[PDB]
Design a protein around this motif. Structure first.
Motif, PDB file in Angstrom:
ATOM      1  N   UNK A 266      -5.414  12.151 -15.926  1.00 45.62           N
ATOM      2  CA  UNK A 266      -4.875  12.042 -14.573  1.00 45.62           C
ATOM      3  C   UNK A 266      -4.497  10.617 -14.188  1.00 45.62           C
ATOM      4  N   UNK A 267      -5.439   9.675 -14.252  1.00 44.14           N
ATOM      5  CA  UNK A 267      -5.168   8.242 -14.086  1.00 44.14           C
ATOM      6  C   UNK A 267      -4.413   7.943 -12.783  1.00 44.14           C
ATOM      7  N   UNK A 268      -5.109   8.171 -11.668  1.00 45.15           N
ATOM      8  CA  UNK A 268      -4.553   7.978 -10.332  1.00 45.15           C
ATOM      9  C   UNK A 268      -4.953   6.623  -9.752  1.00 45.15           C
ATOM     10  N   UNK A 269      -4.020   6.002  -9.028  1.00 46.16           N
ATOM     11  CA  UNK A 269      -4.225   4.733  -8.339  1.00 46.16           C
ATOM     12  C   UNK A 269      -4.415   4.969  -6.847  1.00 46.16           C
ATOM     13  N   UNK A 270      -5.094   4.035  -6.175  1.00 47.31           N
ATOM     14  CA  UNK A 270      -5.300   4.150  -4.734  1.00 47.31           C
ATOM     15  C   UNK A 270      -5.982   2.896  -4.193  1.00 47.31           C
ATOM     16  N   UNK A 271      -5.789   2.668  -2.889  1.00 48.91           N
ATOM     17  CA  UNK A 271      -6.578   1.711  -2.112  1.00 48.91           C
ATOM     18  C   UNK A 271      -6.524   0.294  -2.675  1.00 48.91           C
ATOM     19  N   UNK A 272      -5.372  -0.359  -2.556  1.00 50.16           N
ATOM     20  CA  UNK A 272      -5.186  -1.706  -3.076  1.00 50.16           C
ATOM     21  C   UNK A 272      -6.019  -2.699  -2.272  1.00 50.16           C
ATOM     22  N   UNK A 273      -6.372  -3.808  -2.923  1.00 54.95           N
ATOM     23  CA  UNK A 273      -7.068  -4.928  -2.303  1.00 54.95           C
ATOM     24  C   UNK A 273      -6.225  -6.182  -2.478  1.00 54.95           C
ATOM     25  N   UNK A 274      -6.563  -7.227  -1.728  1.00 53.76           N
ATOM     26  CA  UNK A 274      -5.914  -8.521  -1.894  1.00 53.76           C
ATOM     27  C   UNK A 274      -6.871  -9.615  -1.443  1.00 53.76           C
TER      28      UNK A 274
ATOM     29  N   UNK B  28       0.810  -1.215   0.000  1.00 56.67           N
ATOM     30  CA  UNK B  28       0.000   0.000   0.000  1.00 56.67           C
ATOM     31  C   UNK B  28       0.843   1.264   0.000  1.00 56.67           C
ATOM     32  N   UNK B  29       2.130   1.163   0.324  1.00 54.67           N
ATOM     33  CA  UNK B  29       3.043   2.297   0.284  1.00 54.67           C
ATOM     34  C   UNK B  29       3.682   2.488  -1.079  1.00 54.67           C
ATOM     35  N   UNK B  30       4.043   1.393  -1.751  1.00 52.91           N
ATOM     36  CA  UNK B  30       4.654   1.495  -3.069  1.00 52.91           C
ATOM     37  C   UNK B  30       3.661   2.031  -4.089  1.00 52.91           C
ATOM     38  N   UNK B  31       2.383   1.676  -3.951  1.00 53.49           N
ATOM     39  CA  UNK B  31       1.379   2.037  -4.945  1.00 53.49           C
ATOM     40  C   UNK B  31       0.787   3.424  -4.718  1.00 53.49           C
ATOM     41  N   UNK B  32       0.729   3.898  -3.474  1.00 52.57           N
ATOM     42  CA  UNK B  32       0.094   5.173  -3.168  1.00 52.57           C
ATOM     43  C   UNK B  32       1.042   6.361  -3.297  1.00 52.57           C
ATOM     44  N   UNK B  33       2.322   6.130  -3.595  1.00 53.46           N
ATOM     45  CA  UNK B  33       3.278   7.214  -3.778  1.00 53.46           C
ATOM     46  C   UNK B  33       3.883   7.216  -5.177  1.00 53.46           C
ATOM     47  N   UNK B  34       3.397   6.364  -6.075  1.00 54.65           N
ATOM     48  CA  UNK B  34       3.808   6.467  -7.466  1.00 54.65           C
ATOM     49  C   UNK B  34       3.056   7.617  -8.134  1.00 54.65           C
ATOM     50  N   UNK B  35       3.759   8.540  -8.798  1.00 51.28           N
ATOM     51  CA  UNK B  35       3.096   9.753  -9.268  1.00 51.28           C
ATOM     52  C   UNK B  35       2.021   9.428 -10.294  1.00 51.28           C
ATOM     53  N   UNK B  36       0.915  10.175 -10.305  1.00 54.72           N
ATOM     54  CA  UNK B  36      -0.083   9.969 -11.361  1.00 54.72           C
ATOM     55  C   UNK B  36       0.511  10.263 -12.727  1.00 54.72           C
ATOM     56  N   UNK B  37       0.054   9.519 -13.727  1.00 52.29           N
ATOM     57  CA  UNK B  37       0.597   9.633 -15.075  1.00 52.29           C
ATOM     58  C   UNK B  37      -0.318  10.501 -15.922  1.00 52.29           C
ATOM     59  N   UNK B  38       0.294  11.312 -16.788  1.00 51.95           N
ATOM     60  CA  UNK B  38      -0.442  12.092 -17.776  1.00 51.95           C
ATOM     61  C   UNK B  38       0.218  11.932 -19.141  1.00 51.95           C
ATOM     62  N   UNK B  39      -0.269  12.670 -20.131  1.00 51.44           N
ATOM     63  CA  UNK B  39       0.340  12.712 -21.459  1.00 51.44           C
ATOM     64  C   UNK B  39       0.281  14.128 -22.027  1.00 51.44           C
TER      65      UNK B  39
END
Lengths: 49, 32, 116
Positions: free
Chosen positions: C57-65, C41-52
């Motif tokens: 915006x294409x933001x990630x958050x709140x992983x599940x397992x 949950x730390x590696x995924x919530x601090x990867x910068x949002x991607x644009x072009x």
């Protein structure tokens, strides 16, 4: 001592940067045509797995 | 259970047999 | 009250309690549990949002397992079954995503996708 925790957190960072590169290129190939891009086919499941 | 009883009865025996301990072949450090 | 000369028996009760509370491979299990529970949950919530050309915006958050499942119909794979069929005892990983975007002419949308 780097146990199974940091050893795997070291992999996961690179393997999560790779799939963001892949979604980057898949959005690039789809916005330049002027159409819209779908992330479902952009997220390459075979990078982490 | 018998072992935890045996240990404590052996410990009371150790406490009771405290008259004189003279056997030689065992040592411990005494620096300074 | 203090415990003099009874300490041989008492010195090992604490050791037995230690090895009941904690197994012998606890440093592995704790490390992997901490990985799964915080580091993913730390590696995924601090990867910068991607644009072009407009961009998104294409933001990630709140992983599940989830739990290890094989498929056929989805069923839980027991580690012995994964050991016998040369499978890989693993669990899938899901996350939430928002494909927000804004373009020229002052037009925007905020679509999202749970558990991708």
């Amino acid at each position: 001592l780097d146990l199974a925790g940091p050893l795997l957190a070291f992999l996961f960072r690179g393997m999560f940067k790779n799939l963001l590169k892949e979604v980057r290129i898949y959005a690039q190939k789809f916005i330049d045509r002027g159409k819209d891009f779908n992330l479902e086919l952009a997220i390459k499941t075979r990078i982490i797995s | 259970e018998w072992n935890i009883v045996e240990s404590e009865k052996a410990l009371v025996a150790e406490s009771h047999n405290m008259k004189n301990q003279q056997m030689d072949p065992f040592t411990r450090r005494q620096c300074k | 009250e203090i415990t003099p000369d009874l300490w041989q028996e008492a010195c090992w009760i604490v050791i037995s309690s230690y090895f009941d509370e904690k197994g012998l491979v606890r440093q592995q299990l704790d490390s992997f549990d901490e990985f799964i529970q915080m580091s993913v949950q730390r590696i995924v919530e601090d990867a910068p949002p991607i644009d072009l050309p407009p961009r998104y915006l294409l933001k990630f958050e709140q992983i599940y397992l989830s739990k290890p499942t094989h498929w056929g119909a989805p069923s839980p794979m027991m580690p012995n079954e994964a050991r016998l069929r040369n499978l890989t005892y693993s669990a899938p990983l899901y996350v939430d995503i928002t494909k927000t975007v804004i373009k020229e002419g002052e037009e925007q949308l905020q679509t999202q996708h749970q558990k991708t």
